[PDB]
Amino acid sequence: QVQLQQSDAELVKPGASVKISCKVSGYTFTDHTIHWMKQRPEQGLEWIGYNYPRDGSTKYNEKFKGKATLTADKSSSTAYMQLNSLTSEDSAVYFCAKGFITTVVPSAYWGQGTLVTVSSDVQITQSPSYLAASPGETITINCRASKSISKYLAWYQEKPGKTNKLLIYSGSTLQSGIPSRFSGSGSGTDFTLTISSLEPEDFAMYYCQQHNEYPWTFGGGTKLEIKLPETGHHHHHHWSHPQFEK
Amino acid sequence: QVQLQQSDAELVKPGASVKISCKVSGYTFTDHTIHWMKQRPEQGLEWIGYNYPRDGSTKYNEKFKGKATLTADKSSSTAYMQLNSLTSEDSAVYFCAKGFITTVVPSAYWGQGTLVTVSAGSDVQITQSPSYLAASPGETITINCRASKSISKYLAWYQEKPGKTNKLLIYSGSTLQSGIPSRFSGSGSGTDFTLTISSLEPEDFAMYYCQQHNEYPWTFGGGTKLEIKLPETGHHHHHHWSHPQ
Amino acid sequence: QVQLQQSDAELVKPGASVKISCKVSGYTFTDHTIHWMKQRPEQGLEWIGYNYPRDGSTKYNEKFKGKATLTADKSSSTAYMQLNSLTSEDSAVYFCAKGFITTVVPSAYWGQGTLVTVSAGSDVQITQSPSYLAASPGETITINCRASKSISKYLAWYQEKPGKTNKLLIYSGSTLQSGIPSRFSGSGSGTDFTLTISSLEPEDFAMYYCQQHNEYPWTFGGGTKLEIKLPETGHHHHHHWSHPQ
Amino acid sequence: QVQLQQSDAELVKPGASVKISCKVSGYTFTDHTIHWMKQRPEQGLEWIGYNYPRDGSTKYNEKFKGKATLTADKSSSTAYMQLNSLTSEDSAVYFCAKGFITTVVPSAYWGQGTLVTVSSDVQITQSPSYLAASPGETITINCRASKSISKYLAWYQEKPGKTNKLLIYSGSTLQSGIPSRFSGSGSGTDFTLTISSLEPEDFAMYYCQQHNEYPWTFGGGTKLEIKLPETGHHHHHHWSHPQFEK
Ligand SMILES: [Co+2]
Ligand SMILES: [Co+2]
Ligand SMILES: [Co+2]
Ligand SMILES: [Co+2]
Ligand SMILES: [Co+2]
Ligand SMILES: [Co+2]
Ligand SMILES: [Co+2]
Ligand SMILES: [Co+2]
């Protein structure tokens, strides 16, 4: 029961700052970095940087240097990110996640996100971007890296109302607690995620992430939809990217 | 310069018959079988049977006997299929295709199809997935195909583009048909197969079908549509999910 | 023997430019304008602008200035469109088309289109309906088109079939383009128009678009897909309906 | 408030008979014929015949002679149809409807149907058979008759959970109580129904019917679906042909 509780949605004017928070419980706060991520529907997931609470050190993705300031308060087990000189391009959902010590290791423990509304790197190509199939069938998602990342590709399942779930890391090792019908493959630049015996729960956003070097970089995302055959009885509901779910 | 020239579309009343034709040129007619397939548009493909012109032998998909009668006229190098007691469920596109008398592997030469409009058990089941997928030129996608019992390696893949005859991409799981670009590849054995297209080109966006050619009747997957992706918008939109009962 | 020969598909990174070309043959190049259109596949068509080669004049859809620059080279009878500061929303098919220097009515001669892939106010609004419809060869269907303000009679209709250039069916509401079969007819005036196809033939199943040519910028309906009907089954199946909030 | 209350669904073995009933209220029973119709999803609407309660006379469509027997009981204002020598082709929904005296006039007052499960005429081509459009837009349905029916074509809206609704009769005259955005046109063999300012209520089965001569004959039917744009919020539900709604 590692929980990251993020602060309420923010609606700010252009040019202002916002400081959003991340309250951690269920492990010793000072033992691991806190990572911060930005997500927009069009641009996907981006890594802003990490902050190490024990020591107060930070590492920033060059693209977010200056834009973001990461701090931590050891007494409250709370991490903060302040965004300054806000513009409409800063409108997104921002996530915090527990890292392992100060490693490149991807996080399996993400916060729920905070919506902010203003009013030589590894590039990864993810495909297909949208996919439809049936319960019981098997589908495959591809991710191609712009340079060799060895075997260090992770896969996430992002479902509405749940925090981001780590499926696979290091290319093919199945995360604890994930069903074996999830499997990953590849090394160097060409990777795949295969989901077999599809079930209705599997509708979600899927993302790959290289964890071979900083900055962390993500694929553009894949949306998976599941049939029901119109011969049977069922329901049709709606879900959206987290930015519109908030 | 191979033609399988098929007769024009038919618009007939229920209860009638039609005799559609398949005029072959560019190889020895009596040295090869003619296979016949039924498709309802965009949807599932089925194998009707084959006719061997030299001796007049026919083999039918059990489900199509009585419905179809296959004959050939050796003098004109034309093969025929007669459909009788037509009903609305007979409304479909019907294809002829050159058969090989040496392998189980299907041929790369199909007719353009004939449209028929009616108005006024231990077979291998093939499941294809995903049924639709969106990507961009330059990217890589992979299509899955599963057989209900082992077909060893004998799985073929086809690309259907409108206004062109069916294009054989792969047969026997991984062997590339002559003339097919190397960005296509297939793999699998027994029951689990995949077709992978890398560095997609604008022409690869199309319909795809797998087909086991390990035993008769030949059976096909339901089809996969590869469409050009639309960009994720920045405005409030919704997606769908479902659950039974 | 008219060609509008368009350059090959582009796969470019965001922020780059592309210069796509349109090589005309079969009529006097400098005696006619070149119009340019953007389409995202299957979806909405937009008019970018025109270029007159003899004097170099250009007229832009206000929404596309800065995005597009139209030029022509009279010596090679080639017209060009340069797109700059490319973004993913620029990913589309771009068409050139012969313009008339005498009427407002559009021409029947389009290029085949060029695909561009980017990765790694008082205008007349045109609403087309139904967006999809199913029928059978031999039957009759009619497509509606409504303009947000009066366009008098100046409405055109196009048939888009894959692998063929855009086909002009009707212009000015009811006038049949040369060579178009009489089972096509259009009617309407002001804001309410229809295209009616009787005795449908297998080739008429396609995408259709209306376009007002009464004022610039030229604007298009969203498109209508005419598909072959599937037969009503005798087994328990479900249909859908919806309601807001 | 003319009501036709039909008896409960029947499930019979092949070769048996069934007698289904039709209890009328809201007008004088003996003043008008009772029409009986058969509906299957594939074959559409068919006219079996009518029975005149005042006099006990019957008129049958030749195709149903022998198969159906129509009777009426004046004391109970109930009409009956007995189906004999049942086969699986007899499985359908059967409707009764109030006629006007003993005329060809189409009915605006239909019963809800009874589902039965076994375990030189004017032919009309209706097209399109399926149609999708948006609120506010306008659509057009065609019906072509095999011989001249003058102006005598009617249009019905069949919505799940409602009895069949008469929209237009005599080609173009709008039935009382129907909105003016419904309109019909044509004479001889070529007819159209036009629905403008489409609203979500308009999803239904639509059928044309010639009322120029007996036997009454119907078009094959058109299914109309209405968008909602996925940009807004809405619900998706299911409906079916009456045979599966029962
Ligand atoms: Co459904
Ligand atoms: Co539900
Ligand atoms: Co919403
Ligand atoms: Co989306
Ligand atoms: Co249905
Ligand atoms: Co929806
Ligand atoms: Co509801
Ligand atoms: Co049901």
Residue numbers in the entry:
A (entry chain B), D (entry chain B): 19 to 137, 158 to 284
B (entry chain A), C (entry chain A): 19 to 138, 157 to 281
Provide the publication's sentences verbatim.
Polyhistidine tags are peptides consisting of 6 or more consecutive histidine residues (6XHis) that are commonly used for protein purification by immobilized metal affinity chromatography (IMAC) due to their metal binding properties. However, the 6XHis motif usually behaves as an intrinsically disordered region, adopting various conformations, and is thus extremely rare in electron density maps.
ScFv 2A2 crystallized in space group I121 in mother liquor containing 10 mM CoCl2 and the structure was solved by molecular replacement at 2.5 Å resolution using a homology model of the scFv VH and VL domains as the search model. The asymmetric unit is composed of 2 scFv molecules that form a tetramer with a twofold crystallographic axis, i.e. a dimer of dimers. Each scFv monomer adopts the classical arrangement of the VH and VL domains, and further dimerizes through a ~ 650 Å2 VL−VL interface that is stabilized by 15 hydrogen bonds. These 16–19 residues form an extension that adopts a tetrameric arrangement stabilized by 8 Co2+ ions. The tetrameric assembly contains two 6 residue-long β-strands related by the twofold symmetry axis, and the 8 Co2+ ions coordinate 3–5 protein residues each, resulting in 4 unique metal binding sites. In site 1 and 2, Co2+ ions are coordinated by residues belonging exclusively to the two 1st protein chains, thereby stabilizing the dimeric assembly. In contrast, the Co2+ coordination at site 3 and 4 connects protein chains across the twofold crystallographic axis and thus stabilizes the tetramer. Overall, the sidechains of Glu268 from the sortase recognition motif, His279 from the strep tag, and all the histidines from the 6XHis (His271-276) are directly involved in binding to Co2+ ions, with the exception of His271 from the 1st chain. The motif, named TetrHis (for Tetrameric His-Tag), packs against the scFv surface making hydrophobic contacts mainly involving framework residues Pro238, Phe241, Met243, Lys261, Glu263, and Leu266 and Trp277 from the motif.
